[PDB]
Amino acid sequence: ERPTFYRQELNKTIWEVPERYQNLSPVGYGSVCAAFDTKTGHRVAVKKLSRPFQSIIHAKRTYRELRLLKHMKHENVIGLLDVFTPARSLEEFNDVYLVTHLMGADLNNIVQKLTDDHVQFLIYQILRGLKYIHSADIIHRDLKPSNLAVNEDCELKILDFGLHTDDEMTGYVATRWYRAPEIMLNWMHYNQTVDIWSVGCIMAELLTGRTLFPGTDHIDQLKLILRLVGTPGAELLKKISSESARNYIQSLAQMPKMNFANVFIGANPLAVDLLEKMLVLDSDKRITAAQALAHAYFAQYHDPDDEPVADPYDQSFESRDLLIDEWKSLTYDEVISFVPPP
Ligand SMILES: O[C@@H](c1ccccc1)[C@@H]1N(CC2CC2)[C@H]2CC[C@]1(O)CC2
Ligand SMILES: [Cl-]
Ligand SMILES: [Cl-]
Ligand SMILES: [Cl-]
Ligand SMILES: [Cl-]
Ligand SMILES: [Cl-]
Ligand SMILES: [Mg+2]
Known about the structure:
Elements: E1 5-10, E2 13-18, E3 21-26, E4 30-37, E5 43-49, H1 56-71, E6 82-84, E7 97-101, H2 107-110, H3 116-135, E8 148-150, E9 156-158, H4 174-177, H5 181-184, H6 193-208, H7 218-229, H8 234-237, H9 243-250, H10 260-263, H11 269-278, H12 289-293, H13 324-336
Antiparallel strand pairs: 1-2, 3-4, 4-5, 5-7, 6-7, 8-9
Bound molecules: ligand SRJ, chloride ion (5 copies) and magnesium ion (MG).
One chloride ion binds at residues 313-314.
């Protein structure tokens, strides 16, 4: 049976939601409210999408977000508690609302004086969630401290999957400091190995308290990266598709890889070893999430019987060309077929 909905205007926005959601309070693409869910007892975040079907690009993006959130079922990844529309039919369908557990602090708000044990547990949880994500052939693309939610018990969830413009990535900006060089400069077709570079940048910052590659622009950032990991050899240069990018790289004086024990002074030697395996310029040679979980740095947390993989995820829609109303109808079907978690 369809629940009873109630209407209210909050901060010049109309919200029409099921009675189960009470005490709505604005907190922040879309608009977001905190609420109390009387069915589950959780405090929740409720997001009303802004203009979900205003263009082919926007309609496909709405479908993409709903498909991804419906699939993710893992302790270290954001999940979907509910999705609803007040519409009674496809003909009157206009608005989409998404519901998840309310999170209060990200990794920035946490990072305290972190012990090495704290770094072990936080990085372990990122890699456990990434093993799951990558097993479904999903690439996050935007891992950074503001996209990692952390609670009082140091438990962590990955959120805000890549679903960013040129201006957003320009200058002295945290939106670029965690990106792998091959994607920052469009060197080649990237893959899931981009996320491991980001994990290395995050782990370094938890150990030192400082951003690893805080470049003032794309070129300054590349210079900081190459000073640490070395300039590329002929093997990697062959993999860069742009002749212009290859010519630029070859204009730089050659540099050896630095000694990571003299950069990360005083850190656990096992942490230093893991950083050397994540921060490798050639993405083909980086450690994977599944391999990293078995590294000795995580010995007190690793349990191979409690590191699950995902159900298969069909992304064939990404190469499909449809009209606005066809993306809209596919989205409607996914709203009405949602089954809540236990
Ligand atoms: O996109 C928002 C969202 C809300 C409800 C369901 C699904 C997604 C997401 N929420 C997640 C809330 C759990 C904390 C926050 C505001 C913007 C943000 O992008 C990142 C932090
Ligand atoms: Cl209800
Ligand atoms: Cl509607
Ligand atoms: Cl950030
Ligand atoms: Cl040289
Ligand atoms: Cl699927
Ligand atoms: Mg974010």
